[PDB]
Design a protein around this nucleic acid. Sequence first.
DNA 1: TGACAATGTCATCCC
DNA 2: CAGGGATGACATTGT
Length: 74
Amino acid sequence: GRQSKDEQLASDNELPVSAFQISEMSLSELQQVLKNESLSEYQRQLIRKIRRRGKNKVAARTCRQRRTDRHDKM
DNA sequence: TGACAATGTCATCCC
DNA sequence: CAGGGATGACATTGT
Ligand SMILES: CCCCCCCCCCCC[N+](C)(C)[O-]
């Protein structure tokens, strides 16, 4: 199969959570993660970029569906 | 491997 | 605040 780059990222950077986790975990969850873990700044930054992408791709989705839904047919 | 579809990324605006 | 939803353009990936 295959992995996301963000998964590779998280992995390369030894993040205590997964890309998937990162992006889907709830905010309060994430916050625990962040108050409890030793995370360089780079790792912190990373986690934020990952979540961004992570939420945006989902978002990209819909859009398109709506895009594609709304015109293509209806 | 090359076409064509599909997904992801990023910049921006928004709330 | 901040985080995060929309969407348009461009990029990478999948089949
Ligand atoms: C959707 C659920 C995602 C939230 C998962 C949180 C689990 C992270 C725990 C990592 C543990 C690492 N450590 C430092 C405690 O050993």
